[PDB]
Amino acid sequence: TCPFYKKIPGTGFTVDAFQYGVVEGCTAYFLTHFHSDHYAGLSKHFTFPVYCSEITGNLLKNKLHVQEQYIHPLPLDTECIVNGVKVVLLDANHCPGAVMILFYLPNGTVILHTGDFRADPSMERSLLADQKVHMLYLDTTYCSPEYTFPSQQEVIRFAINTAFEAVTLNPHALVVCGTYSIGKEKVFLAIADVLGSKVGMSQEKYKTLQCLNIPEINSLITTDMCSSLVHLLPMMQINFKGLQSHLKKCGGKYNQILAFRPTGTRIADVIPQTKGNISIYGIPYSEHSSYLEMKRFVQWLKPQKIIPTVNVGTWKSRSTMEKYFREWKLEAGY
């Protein structure tokens, strides 16, 4: 059945609750972002209306083939009505099109649903600050102190640097990036930027990127591999065996590959794995809050209830996160 943590109490709304068939007493459904944990169940003939950002809707429309009529896009940083409830979508600083949602219930209660997000101080200078928020549905993906990774700013600076090095050194060398779902585009876009390349890819992915309407995207991407000296390949293809296969299958224009895996302490001290003329790099590009980013965020927010939405399936997990919420409540004095 649909769990209590996917339901907005007060309304008949749900958030990312498409894998449960029809939820009883659910007048509208909300999609925070286009990630498959969060959209599973959305067939092209899903018959209830869906509320989301523009971008998430494009991806629904084109990848999952749902009809304009059942797809209600909504602008960011704007007060909107939906089944007579005030709602606002805020940028989640997650993947393209991802949003947090504020529900302003008619009784007076105000609910933030982070969805997936990467807490940032800039969110404290937002619509959020214009009132107290009582309940918080919290992306707790990394709610544990060992989870510390650097700023996206650092990683990309590094990856830009590692890139401009290897190509200025060997101008017949190819940067490659790993990828599966949307997100982490700034990695591969920022390298292409600095080497004045376009970004080559398979068509599914090219299509996926055309949904996101990035400024001047046509001039930053392509499906003809040859012309692009930075290529995106599926994450599974990012191994020495796969990168040989790829370098044969270009017609011998590139003699050396610099790869990147974006999934997973100091950044300058990072060292690759080299086997041949193939350097692979594991880089920690998160689009989720670290322990401290989250902490700061919630401690600023000072919510009354907090409802975690992630690592929710076991009691060890549930009570460990509840301990950290107690610590934060106490430390900040709310």
Ligand X SMILES: CO/N=C(/C(=O)N[C@@H]1C(=O)N2C(C(=O)O)=C(CSc3nc(=O)c(=O)[nH]n3C)CS[C@H]12)c1csc(N)n1
CB of 48 or CB of 180, closer to Ni ion? 180
Cα–Cα nearest to 45, from 66, 71, 31, 17 = 66
Of residues 6, 38, 118, 246, which one binds ligand X by CB under 6 A?
38
Q: Of ligand X, Ni ion, none, which one sits near residue 79, judging by CB under 5 to 8 A according to partner kind?
A: none
CB of 6 or CB of 35, closer to Ni ion? 35
Which residues make up the interface to Ni ion (CB under 5 A)?
35, 116
Cα 150 to chain centroid distance, Å, stands at 16
How far is CA 305 from each of CA 13, 65, 134, 144, 223, rounded to the nearest angstrom?
18, 37, 6, 19, 48
- Candidates 31-39, 223-231, 300-308, 325-333: pick the segment binding ligand X (CB under 6 A): 31-39
* Structural gaps in the chain: residues followed by a C–N separation over 2.5 Å: 264
What's the Rg (C-alpha) of the chain?
22
- Binding residues for ligand X restricted to 170-199, rule: CB under 6 A: none
Q: Of Ni ion, ligand X, none, which one sits near residue 114, judging by CB under 5 to 8 A according to partner kind?
A: none
CB of 35 or CB of 295, closer to ligand X? 35
- Asked if 174 contacts 269 with a C-beta cutoff of 8 angstroms, the reply is no
- Candidates 35-43, 152-160, 243-251, 297-305: pick the segment binding ligand X (CB under 6 A): 35-43
- Binding residues for ligand X restricted to 49-88, rule: CB under 6 A: none
Sign of CA dihedral 112, 118, 123, 129: positive
Q: Of ligand X, Ni ion, none, which one sits near residue 289, judging by CB under 5 to 8 A according to partner kind?
A: none
How far is CA 108 from each of CA 35, 111, 112, 135, 269, rounded to the nearest angstrom?
32, 10, 13, 12, 51
- How many CA atoms within 13 Å lie on the side-chain side of 48? 20
Q: Least distance (Å) from Ni ion to the CB of residue 259?
A: 23
Q: Of Ni ion, ligand X, none, which one sits near residue 37, judging by CB under 5 to 8 A according to partner kind?
A: ligand X
Beta bridge partners, 242, equal none
Tokens representing 234?
């599926």
Cα torsion through 134, 73, 140, 19, rounded to 10: 110
Q: Is 35 in the site for ligand X (CB under 6 A)?
A: yes
Q: Of ligand X, Ni ion, none, which one sits near residue 204, judging by CB under 5 to 8 A according to partner kind?
A: none
- Candidates 32-40, 82-90, 276-284, 291-299: pick the segment binding ligand X (CB under 6 A): 32-40
The arrangement of strands across the sheet holding 273-274 comes to: 221-222, 199-200, 230-234, 173-179, 256-258, 278-280, 273-274
CB of 94 or CB of 205, closer to ligand X? 94
**Stretch 88-127: interaction string toward ligand X, x if CB under 6 A:** ----------------------------x-----------
Of residues 27, 263, 274, 320, which one binds ligand X by CB under 6 A?
263
Residues contributing to the site for ligand X (CB under 6 A): 35, 37-38, 116, 141, 263
